[model samples]
Target: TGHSYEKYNNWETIEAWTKQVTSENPDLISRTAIGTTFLGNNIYLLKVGKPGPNKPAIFMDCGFHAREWISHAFCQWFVREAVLTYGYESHMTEFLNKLDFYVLPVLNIDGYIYTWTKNRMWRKTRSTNAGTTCIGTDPNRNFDAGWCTTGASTDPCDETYCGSAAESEKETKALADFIRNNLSSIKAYLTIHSYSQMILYPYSYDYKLPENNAELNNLAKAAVKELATLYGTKYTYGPGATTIYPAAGGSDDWAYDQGIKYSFTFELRDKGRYGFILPESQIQATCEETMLAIKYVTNYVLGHL
Candidate 1:
């Protein structure tokens, strides 16, 4: 089987695994097709939780930029962890019992498959542009925040080309619509990306801060510290715009604007020596540590809720 956690999977294995996992663990997990990718690939969302009243959700997605194979791997590893430890591990048991984790394993399916088949560095959706020859739009830059402003591009030929409009990409719209439709239940938003080793909270679109900036900052700090404890991998934390670059139209910013107060963007693994081409052997270490950060955030969100 090509469904190994230590390896980066293609779109098909991930699609099947979503069904496989849910079927194996009927009570704790369920699958849904939120929408289809530009290439007609199903976008699967796995909700991992025990059925219960007053169970809020934490919506998390991975592989926003398709070439970040590590991001895709981490999401799968996360779900596996969720399923395996739910009843046995105390912390995880409490987590699953109290909150539903809506995990999107691979957000950009078309671009991800394109990376495996055509270009290993592909970073956008595989949709044909309106008037240009460029193949896709950067899904990260297509959110409806400070869209296409300072750190994003307007030309379709560029990497960070914001789509024709905010949420112009179908993938972005589908995920956003899911969040909006479940706004009453989703209290936190966590999207995973890679090669930066940072935990960032809103305002990637601009320097303007989210309302609960102080708590988010501390949360990011504590989360990264927890991540570091496992592997001693250093991670920086702050608002995206100043912490990194001001990339307008980021989902974290959009989520915060939607009142999901604990929204965060986690940039995982090495700090550019390997970039998006992270090795498969390092997958376990990276995911293991990142899991710590995720659990820390989940615990924090649970307490505050």
Candidate 2:
């Protein structure tokens, strides 16, 4: 019932935090009216920086998996720190001079809301396909990449279902449209997920490396190191296929195919100890450590881009 940035948190707490971010930092954080979710809830994309009208920007999104509340918290706090944290301000202020940042705090709005109103363990978009009674699609697996190729299922009841096809769901369609519409300005994309402490890159469809594999891996390693410095929370970094499961049609892979060399998928907090039920008390530490890594990665990307 109570929402505060404490030792433990829930989806509601994270949502409240994001609302506060937009309310408190109106100048730097403007909510973009991307579209609406399946349940008709507004899908907001928060643009958090004034890098410029044409400066290269980094894009971030979290909570694509509706049950991952920590993923959502990391993003809400990331936006909070963009204007409040000392290091973030220095880096964002400087980077905004030449770079912009876009963050979608929660992509699966209907599913996320469902977790609050219906089920806490749900993990998909609320889009029902033909002949299926169950609602929702794996938004991460619903991207335009090698969708349904490897780490996804065709069954509507499966957690990793790739949906009917790429961008079949309205949520995925809206996200894809935004990314495509702003392809020119956005040079890097980072998607945040939960339970695993990882910094993963592209070519998840197979073990084969993407062309920029070496550089991407190096940057991810460096980011992990920076995060470690904050709390010694060691993170394993590698391509998605090798590090974890081989999930095709992921946003990270899709962005990489779109030519974003610095594309990444950050699996944040707990390392699966608590799985998706990470407490509010862990939110600050998670944010503090992860922000360091993100800023480090941001700086590194800036040098390359």
Candidate 3:
């Protein structure tokens, strides 16, 4: 499969790329289908690392929101960087040798397909609602942490519908299952999103601060500073409720509650100038700058471990 990391790929292309990338980099990457999406799409996970025993991991997923094309694009770029820079870039090579990265390039596969084929603004999973014509649930807002309480919608027609319950969507459950089963080895959870230029931490469901709020604040501030060195991109950083909107049931919050203290959500690229429909021209720069922040965080995690 011929896929470009600098472009937003369709689900078909991404699916093929997952398999092809695994095969091409046998020593560094292994492909596994952790679960299935609502529309029967495989939730493929790419484990990127060198052969090692009892290695702690960093679990990172992208495309939680269907229209966040840059989010998905960055995951692919991250894998490419891991594969290409292994044994070359000292930081990446050492990082891979010590810790593995479980990268999910796309989560809401059905919704992503719908966005490309039908609605470009779709932001949820393509699952039928009970007794209504409204289709899809906000996978991000369907997590089990203070779910549907605030900053979420109860009506199925709304964009941020929390669904019947937490992890209602098949895709959402699939992700939660993977994290739960692998929680012993997963030290950090990083969920990638787009449009707003910010790096957010836990407690998005309310104004309550996480136990390690000071450390998280410092980490996010350092990350954004590292990110700006490459392209001078400005990024606000803090708790999601106060930093961004108070989005309940967020995957980051759910992950953090699962004991992953380093959990964070990255809102990548331009702030409303281009929004989710970021230009293809800016993909490379966006991923490059974001990589700086990711590496910085990873370095910090490794030191702590």
Candidate 4:
């Protein structure tokens, strides 16, 4: 009796829910084992869509930081809605039939579980750093884009620690490796974080503009407008550095550098009131608006392809 949209769920419940969705929608969805987390937990990806030869796909991941539980909820809600509305909703059905979605629910598995059992505010991986007492590195900052150069720290104990070296964390390496292996099929990369209602594009490491900056900005504007129609939720959209703050080593920038031109990062939900501890009651509204935004981007990508 697991409800996909019900309050915040622990690791076990979320895993069960993912398995359940694929089981119920055998023809439309299939679960694949991508790799393993540092703590030995299997990282699962749910591929939703009809099978095709080298079908263009969207790669999405949530729970990059352990405390952003709402990010995790949206991924599950997406899978649930895809299964329940595939045949009933025309646009959604058509989207699924055309483009495959690779959704990874928990990227920082060990830290996510630790947030529930030990500290609810934990926001990094649960890996031990050599010559330091710190237990984890910020998973988002472990990417090779601009490793620890800006907006991230070299100090092992810092919350935004970028790790001793780029791709040092297994979690980061696993996802990066998988994306590189499937680069030809993945057209868009969306990483979900929380506490700010913003849709951002790459070049987060510097103030320099991306080659396709104009197009990315235009699509983000349209996507946010569509999202607003759902619950009147306002979202600011722009490049990550100026739009938010300069952040190096983010996966969005790394993905874009790899030539996934449509890579974007979504900072979901309330601006600041709820922060990381977003109330469970707002889950449905958050997911609904997010889905609208995602579909908007998906359709745009489909047309361009």
Candidate 5:
């Protein structure tokens, strides 16, 4: 197996890795150009599973925030695992036979690039926010779920800037359009972020509950439990509002509203010792445990479907 998880990979390396995985596993995995970023980077979505009719899919993305490099590492790690363990492992084999996993490694390409070259702490899209000196909107807060209403900012300079309108950022718009287009097949949505060690569900925009709130809670609990087994990493799982903070226009809420009920957002790793600067040494453990949690959720979604 490739030990790409040993270091936080750049956009180019990730792109190449995805292409390599797809080329190697021609039958089990395939890649698609869902959309392009503002800077003409291809937003690659890898479909991991057997080709079949109307297969229920899990839509997951990482790197919504550029500085949270661990999130990006997990996506890469997932791709490697799915390709390497498909036929060798029973669970992975069954998973590929049943459901297709749509993995988007880096949703925010421009900002991720900026973080490497310009500022290590940069955390928004690269597109300039109109009518302000500040460039980029918080892509997570730019969705149509509850645009700029709560737990977000209107000022372009703010880290939580919700953009001028819903789905304003190209990256956000591309992801939204793809998910919306495939609503019938996408049963779950998982967005990964980092440095909090939490698994959150919908209604980050409001204090309301979805129809399947209890089931969502149960699934989160089970997934968190599975995650804890690997390294005993404690994680809080619940609605985003009370579990963490209310963040309106978040992608998870938007996903739930679109009727893909099994929506979740994972905040991976330590409390704050490293903050956004998580060491590369921790990447393997973070990705390993996170893979367990994600597989638990995917298995649940597969069973329920």
Candidate 6:
């Protein structure tokens, strides 16, 4: 079992667990390798739900930044919980029957694996330019919205390096293309990040609020409240730019601009107490609380959008 008390700190371990999950429950959780990363790492997604028409779609992606293991943990936990509660709970099953969830467990697999093996603080795709020795492009800054405008750099060596063009990075490009293909059904888009407990919404490039800003704020508040019930961990919920630093061309901003009504970027665990070096002991608590928040947000989005 994937949840057999194993701390998933590496990409290979996470992939093995994912394979194990699919092997055990092929009926509920079916795996698909949609695309390959720049360095040829498989970008896998697990489809969870019992299919139905006119149902809203929810997209969940994680592990964009290499060192954020908690994002990886939450994605794995979400897959596990979805498979476990598919038919048992009437509400969850109703969601499964009514909505389709596209769960991308690891977006930047090549970089994520590199973080485990090469550098502990890597935060980009392992892509390189001809003129510089610098490698890796920030997947967060490689999206189609406001690329290289604010909070992003054109320099390939910068930590927040925006790619050569929007959707330049293969991993971000693949997911952006996926969102484009499924725009009609996909009502909500959620991307997971870590080192700060936050629930942020669209318009990161400029601090402007979305048209549905009020509802987005309310939903994020409810999510944070529900999450706090498990362990009292605080979650700051607001516009992305205000809550966290403004990050241009982020996946969430692009997803919002792509007409996904409910778009959120979650930063999980410890409020930077441990930063990216978060211990394995905190994984269970972080994931469990986050699962509640996800369920709440999904359920609410299902009703609203």
Instruction: Please give the TM-score that candidate 3 achieves against the real structure.
Output: 0.99
lDDT (CA) for every model shown?
A: 0.91, 0.81, 0.93, 0.91, 0.90, 0.86
Which 10 residues in a row give candidate 4 its minimum summed lDDT? Answer: 1-10
The root-mean-square deviation over C-alpha atoms between each candidate and the true structure, in angstroms, is 0.9, 2.2, 0.9, 1.1, 1.6, 1.7
Poorest stretch of ten by lDDT in candidate 2: 1-10
Maximum-lDDT candidate: 3
Over 200-303, each residue of candidate 3 has an lDDT whose tens digit, in order, gives: 99889999999999999999999999999987899999998888879899999999999999999999988998898999999999999999999999999999
Model 1: lDDT equals: 0.91
Q: Give the distance in Å from residue 231's predicted Cα in candidate 3 to where it truly belongs.
A: 1.1
**How many clashing residue pairs are found in candidate 6?**
0
- Model 1, span 11-129: residue lDDT tens: 88898899899999999999998888888888899999998997899999998998999999999999999989987999999999999999999999999998989999999898898
After superposition, which runs of candidate 1 have C-alpha atoms over 4 Å from their true positions?
A: none
Give residue 87's error in model 2 in angstroms: 9.8
Please report the TM-score between candidate 5 and the true structure. 0.97
For 125-225, candidate 2 gives per-residue lDDT tens digits of 88877897877788999988888889999999888889888999888889989988989878889999887888889878777788989888889988999
The better-scoring model by lDDT among 3 and 5 is: 3
| TM-score ranking of the models | 3, 1, 4, 5, 6, 2
What local lDDT score does residue 50 receive in model 4, on the 0 to 100 scale? Answer: 81
The clash tally of candidate 5 reads 0
In model 3, where do residues sit more than 4 Å from their true spots?
none
In each prediction, how many residue pairs overlap at the backbone (N, C-alpha, C within less than 3 A)?
0, 12, 0, 0, 0, 0
List the candidate 6 regions with Cα displacement exceeding 4 Å. Answer: 1-6
Q: 1-305 in candidate 4: lDDT tens per residue?
A: 35648688899988887788788889988998788988998888889998887789999999999999999999998988887898899888888888899999899989999999999999999999999888999988899997788999888899999998999988899999999999999999999999799999988899998999999999999999999998899999999999988989999999999989998999898988979999999999999999999999998999999
Candidate 3's C-alpha lDDT? Answer: 0.93
Question: lDDT score of model 5?
Answer: 0.90
Ranking by lDDT: 3, 4, 1, 5, 6, 2
